[PDB]
Design an enzyme around this catalytic site. Structure first.
Site, PDB file in Angstrom:
ATOM      1  N   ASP A  82      -9.989  -5.422  -3.801  1.00 48.40           N
ATOM      2  CA  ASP A  82      -9.670  -4.798  -3.017  1.00 48.40           C
ATOM      3  C   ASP A  82     -10.265  -3.475  -2.510  1.00 48.40           C
ATOM      4  O   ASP A  82     -10.713  -2.585  -3.834  1.00 48.40           O
ATOM      5  CB  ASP A  82      -8.073  -4.030  -3.199  1.00 48.40           C
ATOM      6  CG  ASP A  82      -7.339  -3.365  -2.483  1.00 48.40           C
ATOM      7  OD1 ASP A  82      -7.883  -2.429  -1.517  1.00 48.40           O
ATOM      8  OD2 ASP A  82      -6.026  -3.580  -2.299  1.00 48.40           O
ATOM      9  N   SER A 110       0.723  -1.219  -0.059  1.00 46.97           N
ATOM     10  CA  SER A 110       0.042  -0.060  -0.327  1.00 46.97           C
ATOM     11  C   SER A 110       0.871   1.234   0.008  1.00 46.97           C
ATOM     12  O   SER A 110       1.784   1.309  -0.803  1.00 46.97           O
ATOM     13  CB  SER A 110      -1.097  -0.118   1.046  1.00 46.97           C
ATOM     14  OG  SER A 110      -2.138   0.872   0.900  1.00 46.97           O
ATOM     15  N   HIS A 124      -7.942  -5.835   0.507  1.00 52.79           N
ATOM     16  CA  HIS A 124      -6.799  -4.947   0.812  1.00 52.79           C
ATOM     17  C   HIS A 124      -5.959  -5.938   1.888  1.00 52.79           C
ATOM     18  O   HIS A 124      -5.940  -5.478   3.048  1.00 52.79           O
ATOM     19  CB  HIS A 124      -6.950  -3.631   1.247  1.00 52.79           C
ATOM     20  CG  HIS A 124      -5.814  -2.635   1.263  1.00 52.79           C
ATOM     21  ND1 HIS A 124      -5.248  -2.435   0.054  1.00 52.79           N
ATOM     22  CD2 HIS A 124      -5.186  -2.173   2.208  1.00 52.79           C
ATOM     23  CE1 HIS A 124      -4.134  -1.592   0.451  1.00 52.79           C
ATOM     24  NE2 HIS A 124      -4.069  -1.357   1.647  1.00 52.79           N
TER      25      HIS A 124
HETATM   26  O1  LIG Z   1      -3.022   8.524  -1.305  1.00 55.61           O
HETATM   27  C1  LIG Z   1      -3.761   8.098  -2.207  1.00 55.61           C
HETATM   28  C2  LIG Z   1      -3.634   8.926  -3.345  1.00 55.61           C
HETATM   29  N1  LIG Z   1      -4.455   8.200  -4.622  1.00 55.61           N
HETATM   30  C3  LIG Z   1      -4.883   9.196  -5.487  1.00 55.61           C
HETATM   31  C4  LIG Z   1      -5.657   8.374  -6.575  1.00 55.61           C
HETATM   32  N2  LIG Z   1      -4.563   7.541  -7.232  1.00 55.61           N
HETATM   33  C5  LIG Z   1      -4.775   7.404  -8.768  1.00 55.61           C
HETATM   34  O2  LIG Z   1      -5.530   7.749  -9.396  1.00 55.61           O
HETATM   35  C6  LIG Z   1      -3.345   6.308  -9.116  1.00 55.61           C
HETATM   36  C7  LIG Z   1      -3.622   5.767 -10.310  1.00 55.61           C
HETATM   37  C8  LIG Z   1      -2.299   5.226 -10.947  1.00 55.61           C
HETATM   38  C9  LIG Z   1      -1.742   5.819  -9.561  1.00 55.61           C
HETATM   39  O3  LIG Z   1      -2.230   6.629  -8.793  1.00 55.61           O
HETATM   40  C10 LIG Z   1      -4.056   6.577  -6.354  1.00 55.61           C
HETATM   41  C11 LIG Z   1      -3.105   7.265  -5.029  1.00 55.61           C
HETATM   42  N3  LIG Z   1      -4.502   6.870  -2.326  1.00 55.61           N
HETATM   43  C12 LIG Z   1      -4.690   5.905  -1.218  1.00 55.61           C
HETATM   44  C13 LIG Z   1      -4.154   5.947  -0.032  1.00 55.61           C
HETATM   45  C14 LIG Z   1      -4.559   4.864   0.860  1.00 55.61           C
HETATM   46  C15 LIG Z   1      -4.069   4.933   2.324  1.00 55.61           C
HETATM   47  F1  LIG Z   1      -2.759   5.287   2.276  1.00 55.61           F
HETATM   48  F2  LIG Z   1      -4.743   6.035   3.145  1.00 55.61           F
HETATM   49  F3  LIG Z   1      -4.382   3.708   3.101  1.00 55.61           F
HETATM   50  C16 LIG Z   1      -5.502   4.075   0.411  1.00 55.61           C
HETATM   51  C17 LIG Z   1      -5.936   3.958  -0.685  1.00 55.61           C
HETATM   52  C18 LIG Z   1      -5.572   4.840  -1.681  1.00 55.61           C
HETATM   53 CL1  LIG Z   1      -6.182   4.852  -3.190  1.00 55.61          CL
HETATM   54 CL   LIG Z   2      -1.463   2.475   3.270  1.00 59.82          CL
END
Ligand SMILES: O=C(CN1CCN(C(=O)c2ccco2)CC1)Nc1cc(C(F)(F)F)ccc1Cl
Ligand SMILES: [Cl-]
Ligand SMILES: [Cl-]
Ligand SMILES: [Cl-]
Length: 223
Positions: free
Chosen positions: A167, A112, A201
């Protein structure tokens, strides 16, 4: 400090794995998972993220490599914290090199946000690495990378990206969009995407077996 969780090698290590846990965790659980697939010549290092406020969760303090602001494609990412954390990982790679394990015998990896950090660190450092195991994660600061190949030391780096198809936190789609982007940044012949049916997840045994085969293929025993 606190000091990373270490799975020592059975004999003087000729390779190492640096694995970065996800939000809320320590390095202990992942250290036990890698202990169950350990190779006699590899040292496994699972450092612990500092406890810090997380914006996504009302500034509640919890282990985190950098701040999290949102989960959607338009969400802002913590540019300064991600870069700072990546320089800290580069310093851990440097320690292992100075102490006798060449960087081309080190695999970086994580789960993650830890996986996201491992990709960002590997795709920016000019210390050549053996590979990356990116689990249930995404490429952070994706728009800051070039539109074509990255070039440099890690232009042909091998990457194993793993994702659970159910997930509910990091959509499979972000894992897929990330690997499509990695296939343009580095040689696509060495980028592999593995998906685990019914996995959320989390981790599973088949994923750890695939991680073990990847690690053994890239960090084989040497004379
Ligand atoms: O911080 C983020 C930011 N996120 C923006 C959307 N994104 C993209 O569109 C993408 C596609 C390809 C690369 O990036 C992914 C990153 N996200 C996240 C954090 C956690 C946890 F850290 F809080 F657990 C859990 C789930 C998520 Cl999704
Ligand atoms: Cl995370
Ligand atoms: Cl050792
Ligand atoms: Cl060896």
């Amino acid at each position: 400090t606190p000091l990373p969780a270490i799975v020592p090698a059975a004999r003087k290590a000729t390779a190492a794995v640096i694995f970065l846990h996800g939000l809320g965790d320590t390095g202990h659980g992942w250290a036990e998972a890698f202990a169950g697939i350990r190779s006699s010549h590899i040292k496994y290092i699972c450092p612990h993220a500092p406890v810090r406020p997380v914006t996504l969760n009302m500034n509640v303090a919890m282990p985190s490599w950098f701040d999290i602001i949102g989960l959607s494609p338009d969400s802002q990412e913590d540019e300064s914290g991600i870069k700072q954390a990546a320089e800290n990982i580069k310093a851990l790679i440097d320690q292992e090199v100075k102490n006798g394990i060449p960087s081309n015998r080190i695999i970086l990896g994580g789960f993650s946000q830890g996986g996201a950090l491992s990709l960002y660190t590997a795709l920016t450092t000019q210390q050549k690495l053996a590979g990356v195991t990116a689990l249930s994660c995404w490429l952070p600061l994706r728009a800051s990378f070039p539109q074509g190949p990255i070039g440099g030391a890690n232009r042909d780096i091998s990457i194993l990206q793993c994702h659970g198809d159910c997930d509910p936190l990091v959509p499979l789609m972000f894992g897929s969009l990330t690997v499509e982007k990695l296939k343009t940044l580095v040689n696509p012949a060495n980028v592999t995407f593995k998906t685990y049916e019914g996995m959320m997840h989390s981790s599973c045994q088949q994923e750890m077996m695939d991680v073990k085969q990847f690690i053994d293929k890239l960090l084989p025993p040497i004379d």
